[PDB]
UniProtKB/Swiss-Prot annotation, chain A:
Belongs to the P22 phage major capsid protein family. The insertion domain (I domain) plays an important role in the folding of the capsid protein by acting as an intramolecular chaperone. The keyword Magnesium does not apply. The gene is 5. This is Major capsid protein. It comes from Salmonella phage P22.
Swiss-Prot record, chain C:
It is found in: Virion. Homododecamer. Interacts with the terminase large subunit; this interaction allows the packaging of viral DNA. Interacts (via C-terminus) with the head-to-tail adapter protein gp4; this interaction participates in the head completion. Interacts with the scaffolding protein; this interaction initiates procapsid assembly, thereby ensuring incorporation of only one portal ring per capsid. Interacts with the capsid protein. Disulfide bonds: none annotated. It comes from Salmonella phage P22 (Bacteriophage P22). Belongs to the p22likevirus portal protein family. The chain holds residues 340 to 420 of 725 of the full protein. This is Portal protein. The gene is 1. Forms the portal vertex of the capsid. This portal plays critical roles in head assembly, genome packaging, neck/tail attachment, and genome ejection. Procapsid assembly may initiate with a nucleation complex composed of portal and scaffolding proteins. The portal protein multimerizes as a single ring-shaped homododecamer arranged around a central channel. Switches upon genome packaging from an asymmetrical conformation in the procapsid (PC-portal) to a symmetrical ring in the mature capsid (MV-portal). This change of conformation may serve as a signal for headful packaging. Signal peptide: none annotated.
Swiss-Prot record, chain D:
It is found in: Virion. Self-assembles to form an icosahedral capsid with a T=7 symmetry. It comes from Salmonella phage P22. The record marks W7 as: Involved in capsid stabilization and maturation. The insertion domain (I domain) plays an important role in the folding of the capsid protein by acting as an intramolecular chaperone. Belongs to the P22 phage major capsid protein family. The chain holds residues 55 to 215 of 430 of the full protein. This is Major capsid protein. Interacts (via N-terminus) with the capsid assembly scaffolding protein (via C-terminus); capsid proteins and scaffolding proteins form building blocks that assemble to form the procapsid. Interacts with the portal protein. It comes from the Viruses.
Swiss-Prot record, chain F:
This is Major capsid protein. Interacts (via N-terminus) with the capsid assembly scaffolding protein (via C-terminus); capsid proteins and scaffolding proteins form building blocks that assemble to form the procapsid. Interacts with the portal protein. It comes from Salmonella phage P22 (Bacteriophage P22). It is found in: Virion. The insertion domain (I domain) plays an important role in the folding of the capsid protein by acting as an intramolecular chaperone. It comes from the Viruses. Belongs to the P22 phage major capsid protein family.
Length: 421, 541, 81, 161, 193, 54, 49
């Protein structure tokens, strides 16, 4: 009846995205009084005129910013009955499993946030394993769209495949009827390569989401809308409240079938060169982050238009779209079929804000608290234990507080193979 | 492939392979230092008397005092065929930088933990000292390791009592918040990024827990053949110096001063690297440290392997069952004394109806009265008076209390004496001397004694840094064990006294008495006596 | 035997101490113990000296064999002389 | 272990559940034989019978291992065609096995093994040899029949009779 | 079942006393000149023995053998040679001594041996069992292919209350062959032959 | 030793509890009745509402 | 306020000293005897009553 002491090891998880994403811990008192949010400035872009006399043409200065906040603690509250053999045993294997589960949850939230707030969308009409070097073409498309927009890839880039498409890429490499070094490695091991098509890190992630198709159809922009970059705006009291730059709310005819995470593209708008403002040949892709009302959505890249007439030059310096929405633009939906997502990003686009839970404080007497270290990820939470003689059951809790933020959604991406029909 | 991947795999293998011994040693430490009621679920199961009638702690105190009355220290002796004074300078350095309080404290902590749990340890580190250096503006000092059983994780594939053949070893550091801040300042790390590591106490005893920060240090030893340059000494002979030690600093300064290269050989040696790690990344990757050995010295009690599993045991592990039984039985007997009705008479209410103030306890009456008649039965039934029986301790409780006490008495007898424990401590001190010798050869300035004086050969680089120049003829003294002395003068005084105690009263006895006077400390009168002895010895040729 | 064995307590019919139970609680607030005397059907309670559960005892067999086994080990664990 | 989010978690604790598996032994594997005293004046047949009994017992152990592994195996990868037709079908088979084991997030710290029956091993060798190029893997599969000692992430790939 | 099981040990104090008693009287080798040989014939050999047997490994190996002899009945140790370049005893080599733990199951001797020291054994196998990292070290040290994990008759038993047991095994088989080989009688250019 | 698969039941991540694209496959180890069988992986459903959190 | 010396001017003296699990514990000669002494006082008080 009683069991031996050898654990049948059954699962083994890996957390590559959470390991790779940077971690940020802002000061605790400042966050407490600041409501667990903190603003960071965005790199300044300057306008430029041409001419000799510039009377009354002096511009001003503008410096936009973004905000990073935190959500709710992820706990493993559990109970310990006094008179139980099953509870006396395994109450340490439970702690180990809690650590692994908490790290897994962190990685899952990172992957979901990246997939549902990635603006750059690469799509394909067929599966990866159909034509030759199609997986390389996918990774290269990601790299080329990041290069054309002149994004900041200074601190690294990364491409995450799902296991099925990783196997498709490996199959494409081995079926070559040749064996050099890349085919030999992709045949012996399953690994395609570590650097592919320009990215300096190409991994396979086991828990990328599935981006279910969007049933939205026949939606049009309702009224001309112009979005203007600001750093702050005045509220009802005259107080200047900061304005976030990575969101913009837009009114459409009817937002039916839309949800958080669908990828859209208005018909007519195009990407710019960001730094040089040279019009690209690639349609601007946006991602909806919230469906508010029945006629509003929130899209993460704010479409500052270059041809806008109401924009001051210091605002037009931040343009990222060639033209503005014009009351009839048909909005196309890019995810027209279910498919597990591949996710690419610049390595400094996702961060993990972290805060302590000061339960070691003297106010929390009676309960015993330790620092708890979740593995793989560099996160620390608390491990607390208490017990009420009323029910004669010790209560054990493990808490750890974090918030995943996408500071640059214009750098995060989503690869969508086989988006036909 | 990743460096962290490999390091963590090695650490996890060792951590799982040393799992049962570490948990038993932690149980022994908690039993012998915190409480003998080491159950944790019974912290919320309704209060019952739980006494602590301890009989093992006096034995631990006796053994600790016995091991404290006989200190043991390293003693370097010249090798066979070496010059007769090949160890005096190294012995002087060892005494100088081991006479401090930290060395003795580390040894005493390790010995106490060896007696109680079965394993202890200490560490040898080097620091830059300016005011009172030992040599080359540096000191070699010894630091303690508390709870070495759970804090020092050795290479699993190591089958020696002193872990000489371990290729790596990870030591887990736990520190408060201010401690982590100072640690980060010292090692140039990042203070914002709070580090994390596997909890040394695992999760046994979920109480007795503090807000502490864990980090790890991973030492590894690499044995390889490296290049050694054989120069010709401008004074005499030819010294051999490693290329890795004067690779860029003085590689041309040697020639400029007048050292001419003779040859070039490949000589096998061990180099030790230290890494600072967390569970997620390496903060310092492969920082090379001085010496040829891992700087940790372990002390063991009863040690062995059962089936490829290392088991160590002190003096507390076996007595635990008898002591727990004794505590339980004493608690049961205390409950018997406390919650038990006392001896009082059994009465019917009608037997004393009206006379109940006679029995309350006062002494105001000369006798006790009882009612005799009843209006229905005519006469009350006559039954002999009965008293509630006196509380008693069961024969089983008494017998098993004696048996448990006797069993603990039988089993808590180390040796007949602590000869085996002292021999294991001597083995640890020999390993300490080995490690210290290597570190001294690596960082200190060791002069060479010519038979033609000491010849310290050193030269500085363009960055004003002085590089030690130690020849490859360095291992000239071997380690030994001897009485602990604070200084070379104390050792010499002890030697002269020992010789005096065996030489009869003759000319050697006169010479040794004058020598002992010569080697005395200085006041005024001892100054006069020492001057007299010096002059007599000089005059006697 | 020491751990799991009922200890020495009195045997009572419920009607003997019915109404006086708090006296036998274990407290020392009373000068004596009272008992019921009469029954409405049996007239009077039957008379019989009170019985107490016997104290736990270690059997003579257990004691003798513990001593014999310890002595046997002590005699046979003499390496040489 | 499960998990839950929020600050206030009153009356939301969970118990502990640890599960078990059972491992046992079965019928002993025997070898009997009876000999008369006159039949042991040579003893050569007796010694050889002992040796062959040892070898056959080992073969029986291997047969039982193969049968149990093939009879209780949850993961099934099926192809609608032979493992010889179209290129890299053997690699696709092995890599499909690796992919299901990886996506299931199962524990493979102790290594992984793949076992081909000799027909499928020959088909995989053919898949390597008909490649119209001889770098190193085709050359080894041409000289000897060995596919390789590791394919598509499997630690050990073997042929089992 | 869930029943009490206590160890009221009475044999461990005796074992400790015996171990301490036999540790208090250390023993080593002593080389003495033969009959008719020079008075100082064994000085060099004795000095070399002391030099390369003064280390901690030799003492620990002998102590381990002694303790296993007291407890189980048999212990053992091993003599090995290594190339030492820093402090060699002679010819840039050292001869050191190594422990063997659980010799009763890790050192399997020739069955046709009727001597206590096993000097009439013509072969002996030592079963080296270790973990993954130890196997990597062993392979890289004796020039083996670390990919092929070795296996041998596991000398240990499945101890149920132990979380982890190692699984890498290999064997070292020493065998001795006595034969008549050619010896050359040179003439010394200095003196003698 | 026969291999079966129930139509509509898919594997899970077994750590992240994310639905795999491939049907759960089971291997029958015992046919005990004419209507009862025994399959070697237990099908513990994720969306079952009678299951405790643990 | 800067004071003379390199060391904190407080000298501590310990009896039985050590660490159990990152927690410093010290003991004198009285801590272990308290249970027996309290039991003896209670029993003598009961007998006096």
């Amino acid at each position: 009846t009683l069991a031996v002491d050898e654990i049948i090891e059954t699962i083994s998880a890996i957390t590559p995205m959470a390991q790779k994403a940077k971690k940020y811990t802002p000061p605790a008192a400042s966050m407490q009084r600041s409501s667990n949010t903190i603003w960071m400035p965005v790199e300044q872009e300057s306008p430029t005129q041409e001419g000799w006399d510039l009377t009354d043409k002096a511009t001003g200065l503008l410096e936009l910013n973004v905000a990073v906040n935190m959500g709710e603690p992820d706990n493993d509250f559990f109970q310990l009955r006094a008179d139980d053999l099953r509870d006396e045993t395994a109450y340490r294997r439970r702690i180990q499993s809690a650590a692994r589960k908490l790290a897994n949850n962190v990685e899952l939230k990172v992957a979901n946030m990246a997939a549902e707030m990635g603006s750059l969308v690469i799509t394909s009409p067929d599966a990866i394993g159909t034509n030759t070097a199609d997986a390389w073409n996918f990774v290269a498309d990601a790299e080329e769209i990041m290069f054309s927009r002149e994004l900041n890839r200074d601190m690294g880039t990364s491409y995450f495949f799902n296991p099925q498409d990783y196997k498709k890429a490996g199959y494409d490499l081995t079926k070559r009827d040749i064996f050099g070094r890349i085919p030999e490695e992709a045949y012996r091991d399953g690994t395609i390569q570590r650097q592919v098509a320009g990215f300096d890190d190409v991994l396979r992630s086991p828990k990328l989401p599935v981006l279910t198709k969007s049933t939205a159809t026949g939606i049009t922009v309702s009224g001309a809308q112009s979005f203007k970059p600001v750093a702050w705006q005045l509220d009802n009291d005259g107080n200047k409240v900061n304005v976030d730059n990575r969101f913009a709310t837009v009114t459409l005819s009817a937002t039916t079938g839309m949800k958080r995470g669908d990828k859209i593209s208005f018909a007519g708008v195009k990407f710019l060169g960001q730094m040089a403002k040279n019009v690209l040949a690639q349609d601007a892709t946006f991602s909806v982050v919230r469906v508010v009302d029945g006629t509003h959505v929130e899209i993460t890249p704010k479409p500052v238009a270059l041809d806008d007439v109401s924009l001051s030059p210091e605002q037009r310096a931040y343009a990222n779209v060639n033209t503005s929405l014009a009351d009839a633009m048909a909005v196309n939906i890019l995810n027209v079929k279910d498919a597990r997502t591949n996710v690419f990003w610049a390595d400094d686009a996702i961060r993990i804000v972290s805060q302590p839970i000061p339960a070691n404080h003297e106010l929390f007497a009676g309960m015993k608290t330790t620092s708890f270290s979740i593995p793989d990820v560099g996160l620390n939470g608390i491990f607390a234990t208490q017990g009420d003689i009323s029910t004669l059951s010790g209560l054990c809790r493990i808490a750890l507080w974090y918030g995943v933020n996408a500071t640059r959604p214009e750098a995060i991406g989503v690869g969508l193979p086989g988006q036909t029909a | 492939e990743n460096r962290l991947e490999s390091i963590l795999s090695r650490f996890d293998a060792d951590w799982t392979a040393s799992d049962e011994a570490r948990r038993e040693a932690k149980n022994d430490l908690f039993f012998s230092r915190v409480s003998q009621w080491d159950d944790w679920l019974s912290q919320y199961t309704t209060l019952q008397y739980r006494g602590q009638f301890d009989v093992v702690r006096p034995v631990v105190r006796k053994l600790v005092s016995e091991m404290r009355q006989n200190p043991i220290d390293v003693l370097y002796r010249p090798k066979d065929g070496a010059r007769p004074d090949a160890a005096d300078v190294l012995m002087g350095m060892y005494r100088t930088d081991m006479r401090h309080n930290t060395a003795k404290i580390a040894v005493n902590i390790a010995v106490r933990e060896q007696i109680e749990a079965g394993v202890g340890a200490w560490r040898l580190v080097t620091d830059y000292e300016d005011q009172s250096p030992t040599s080359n503006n540096q000191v070699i000092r010894r630091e303690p390791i508390h709870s070495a059983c759970s804090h020092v994780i050795w290479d699993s594939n190591s089958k020696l009592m002193d872990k000489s053949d371990a290729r790596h070893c990870t030591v887990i550091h736990s520190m408060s918040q201010n401690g982590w801040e100072d640690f980060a300042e010292k090692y140039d790390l990042d203070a914002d990024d709070i580090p994390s590591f596997q909890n040394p106490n695992d999760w046994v005893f979920p109480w007795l827990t503090q807000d502490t920060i864990q980090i790890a240090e991973f030492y590894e030893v690499v044995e390889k053949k490296e290049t050694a340059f054989i120069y010709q000494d401008p004074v005499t002979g030819e010294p051999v110096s490693y290329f890795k030690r004067d690779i860029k600093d003085v590689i041309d300064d040697l020639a400029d001063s007048g050292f001419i290269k003779i040859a070039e050989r490949q000589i096998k040696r061990r180099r030790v690297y230290k890494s600072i790690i967390t569970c997620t990344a390496v903060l310092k990757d492969k920082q090379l440290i001085a010496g040829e050995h891992i700087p940790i010295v372990p002390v063991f009690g009863e040690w062995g392997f059962v089936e490829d599993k290392e088991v160590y045991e002190g003096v507390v592990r076996l007595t635990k069952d008898g002591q727990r039984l004794r505590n339980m039985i004493m608690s049961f007997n205390a409950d018997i004394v406390a919650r038990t009705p006392k001896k009082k008479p059994f009465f019917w209410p009608e037997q004393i109806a009206g006379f109940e103030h006679m029995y309350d306890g006062n002494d105001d009456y000369p006798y006790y009265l009882l009612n005799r008649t009843d209006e229905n039965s005519g006469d009350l039934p006559t039954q002999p008076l009965a008293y509630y029986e006196n509380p008693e301790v069961p024969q089983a409780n008494a017998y098993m209390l004696e048996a448990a006490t006797s069993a603990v008495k039988e089993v808590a007898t180390l040796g007949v004496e602590t000869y085996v424990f002292q021999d294991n401590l001597a083995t640890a001190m020999r390993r300490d001397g080995e490690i210290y010798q290597s570190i001294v050869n690596d960082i200190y300035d060791v002069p060479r004694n010519v038979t033609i004086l000491m010849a310290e050969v050193v030269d500085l680089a363009t960055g004003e840094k002085q590089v030690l120049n130690d020849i490859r003829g360095r291992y000239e003294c071997y380690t030994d064990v001897g009485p602990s002395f604070q200084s070379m003068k104390q050792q010499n005084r002890a030697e002269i006294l020992e010789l005096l105690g065996k030489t009869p009263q003759g000319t050697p006895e006169y010479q040794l008495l004058l020598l002992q006077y010569f080697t005395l400390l200085d006041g005024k009168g001892v100054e006069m006596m020492r001057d007299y002895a010096n002059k007599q010895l000089i005059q006697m040729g």
